[PDB]
Each structure stands twice: as C-alpha cells, then as structure tokens.
Amino acid sequence: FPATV
Amino acid sequence: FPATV
Amino acid sequence: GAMGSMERASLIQKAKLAEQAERYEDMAAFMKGAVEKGEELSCEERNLLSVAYKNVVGGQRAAWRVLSSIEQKSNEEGSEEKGPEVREYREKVETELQGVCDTVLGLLDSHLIKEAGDAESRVFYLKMKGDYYRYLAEVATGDDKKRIIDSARSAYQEAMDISKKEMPPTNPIRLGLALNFSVFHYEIANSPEEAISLAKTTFDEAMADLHTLSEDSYKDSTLIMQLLRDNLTLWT
Amino acid sequence: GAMGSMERASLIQKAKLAEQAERYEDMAAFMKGAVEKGEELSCEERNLLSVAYKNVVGGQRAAWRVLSSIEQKSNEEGSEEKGPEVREYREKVETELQGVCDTVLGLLDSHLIKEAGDAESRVFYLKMKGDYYRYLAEVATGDDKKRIIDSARSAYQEAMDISKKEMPPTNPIRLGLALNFSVFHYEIANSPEEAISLAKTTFDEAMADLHTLSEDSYKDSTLIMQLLRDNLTLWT
Ligand SMILES: *CC(=O)NCC1CC2(CCN(C(=O)C3(Nc4ccc(Cl)cc4)CCOCC3)CC2)C1
Ligand SMILES: *CC(=O)NCC1CC2(CCN(C(=O)C3(Nc4ccc(Cl)cc4)CCOCC3)CC2)C1
Ligand SMILES: [Mg+2]
Ligand SMILES: [Mg+2]
C-alpha cells in the first residue's frame, strides 16, 4: 500500500 | 521477561 | 458519553498514557471525550486525536483487507463452498470500521471544523474529513459510493485550496494533506496521472522552499517529502 | 451470551479467520462462544482457545507494565505530583485484565476441566488455570494475594503430576507446562532455585528422549527446549 500520514 | 507459551 | 464526568485535562493526560501503552482504542475514547467538552483543540491535542483514530482504523483496514482477500478467493472457480461465515465476519469488521469513521466524521462536523479559523487547524480537520470519507470509500459498494468518494474529494479540495493560500509549501500539514490526496487520486478516484502530478509538484515546490527552514523544520519537512518520493517510486 | 445463536462450527471457523486477521479479541469471543456450547474441545480447538486469550491478556499485561512503571516513577522522590490519573488508568487496565482472567478461569471451571479425562486435555487445561492465576498474581497486592499464588501453584502441580505419569518427557504440553511453572517459581513464588532446577531437569529429560521421535516431533520438542535453555541463560 502507498504511504499516508 | 522470561519465555512462556 | 462515558467520559462526560472526567476533566478535560485528565482525558488529555490519559490519552498520552494510552499512547505510551499502545492502547489506541482507549486513546481514541479519551480524545473523543476531550473533543466533546466543546473547547477548541490545541496543536498537540489535534495530533493526539488524529494518532488515536488513525491507529484504530488502520488496524480495522488491515483486518478488512485480510478478510476481503479470503472472501474474494472463496468466490473464484473451483473454490469449495464454505458457507456465509467469511462474508459475515468481513461484514462485522466492515460495520465496526464504518462506525469508527462515522464517529470521527461526527466529531469533525460537531463542531471542530466550524470553529476552526486558523489555517493549520482548518486544513488539518478537512484533511481528516477527507481521510475518513476515503476509508468509507474503500469498503463502499452501494448506491452512495460515488457520493462518499465525492465527499472525500470535496474535503481534500477545500483543505488544498486553504493550504496553498495560507501555508508555505514545506508546512508538514500542507505536505501530509497532499500526500494523502494524491493517494486518494491513485487508489480511490482511478486517477493515477493526477496522483503522480500532485505528488511530484508538491515535492518540487517543497524542495524549493527548504532553504528558508531551521534544521528542525527541515527534518520534519523532508521526512514527509520522502514519503511523496516513496509513492512516486511505487507508481512510476 | 452474544454467540448463543451461532453454530459451534461457524464460531470455530470465525475464530480461525480472526486469527488470520490478528483480531484476537474477536477470536477469544468466538472461542468462548464455542466452549459455551458445552461439548468438549478437540486438540485444534484447545489451541485456538489458548492462542486467543494468550494474545488478549498478553497485550493487557504489556500495557499494565508500562503504566505500572510510570506510576512507580511518579512515587519516587522529587517526582512532581500529577494527580490520580496514572493510578486510575493503571487500575482501569488492571480491572480489564482481571476480567479476562476471570472469564478464562470461568470457562475452565464451567466445565472444561471436569470433563477432561485424557492426559493431553487435562494437563493443558490445568496449565491454563495456572497461567491465568499467575496473571492475577502479577497484579495482586491485597488480602488474597497468597491464595491467588497458591491457586496458580496448585493447578500447575496437578498438571505436573499427571504429565509425569502419562506423557513422555518430550511431549510439547508437558514441556510447555514445565516452562511456565518454572517461570512461576522465578517471577511469582520468589523461588529462583526451584525455577532453575525444574527448567534444567525438564531440558535434560527431554534431551534423553529425543531419539524416539520423528523429524516433525523432534522439531516441535526442540523448539520448546530452546525456550527452557533461553530462560536458564537469563537466570544463570
Ligand atoms: C499545529 C497543529 O495543528 N499540529 C497538529 C499536527 C502535528 C502534525 C502531525 C504530526 N506531524 C508529522 O510530521 C507526522 N504525521 C503527520 C504529518 C502531517 C499531517 Cl497533516 C498528519 C500527520 C508525524 C508522524 O510521521 C509522519 C509525519 C507533525 C505535524 C499536524
Ligand atoms: C492435542 C492437544 O490438546 N493440543 C492442544 C495444543 C497444541 C499445543 C500448543 C501449541 N504447540 C506448541 O508447540 C507451541 N505453543 C505451546 C506449546 C505447549 C503448550 Cl502447553 C502451550 C503452547 C506453539 C507456539 O510456539 C510455542 C510452542 C503444540 C502443542 C497444545
Ligand atoms: Mg456492509
Ligand atoms: Mg494542479
């Protein structure tokens, strides 16, 4: 999965 | 801590 | 609510303890209690709220994905019929996830957003609103799916518009919003070109503004820029 | 209970799904539902029950230790008074831990133990009884502390006596019981010599019986023997 904050 | 199962 | 009798400052103190103990459900319940006191949140308090719910819903999303994979495999050709249990348990976890998202969106709507006048508070809350609509969108399959997606888009877009007007391109809130909106484009809106463009432009504009920062601010901004780069690497 | 309407086999199926999703609270609730159907548990089912509650109470114990450390630090000389919140939140987590322990002990007493006639089932349930009294003992500070410790000892001792009579020294249940009873001696009963003696004797008797085993049984036994060795290394 891609990075989120 | 020591090992327990 | 169950936290109605506990002092605001005690709820914040306990939220911090819960974080140290990695008790994120507790942390989220304490912060929900604190928000419901009706006073605006400080910077630190906004962080505690977001960390608590991110962790709770993050665990739920990971569990939902595990279950959804098992369920998709069960519906493939030659898969033995195992009954309704996989769908039922994926539905249970899904319902609990949706509940947590509704809770967060409810705090934002009653009444965090409307009282948020500063750019940092308003952008942060609108980003959260986009994030929790995005998690709803991840599990949506019905009549309202398009509307849930559009609610995520709308919240992210308002946050983007304010951030570009009021914050420097290196502001960690601006950066984190862009990172997540870019993922929304890629994973939810079926717009990978828009995701890539946003990540690249965000990264490059931030690069250009690093010269203005202290060492500590530089560290904070670059950490998030690296996440933008990581995603770009994944996508290209 | 909330699982009363769900088929036994569905509860077991969902417990397995919950394990794959690392949803251990759910797993434990499904297994509690399965035990309450009133039928004896198979080997696999006993494992699911123990794994679920071990994981739940393990998280609670880790959180309790974090909080207890903070609380002990607060009561040191020169520590600023921060109010009742650390004690209150340690008490909250403690109460929830005690509840889970009482739940497990309740399943064992009503009526898993009394229906367990085979050595593997009886030893395993008595070991669990010792384990959940041991977790109660870890947080006990009152009039009943000695009795809780003795309840742990008594359950472990009955399990030990059956295991030595009915199981080979390499049996993984026998080994795991000895490992945990040895930790009980060291950490709870203030008997480190007894802990060391039990671990060493268990290890050596198992070593001597490895020759009788298949490759797969050898792997299972040696894994637990290594834990005994690890503890011995820690203690000597
Ligand atoms: C003043 C104000 O409103 N501050 C509230 C929050 C502190 C904040 C989040 C944490 N943070 C990070 O740099 C980071 N996570 C993150 C960044 C940006 C956003 Cl919008 C959300 C989260 C910490 C964890 O690792 C990733 C970066 C500092 C800024 C905003
Ligand atoms: C037939 C029967 O009653 N079986 C029930 C359980 C399977 C069992 C536990 C899991 N296991 C292990 O070797 C191990 N954990 C463990 C060993 C011994 C005991 Cl008493 C409890 C747990 C697996 C995880 O890593 C450590 C060893 C096989 C035997 C008993
Ligand atoms: Mg649904
Ligand atoms: Mg643009």
Ligand SMILES: [Mg+2]
């Ligand atoms: Mg107490």
Ligand SMILES: [Mg+2]
């Ligand atoms: Mg002896």
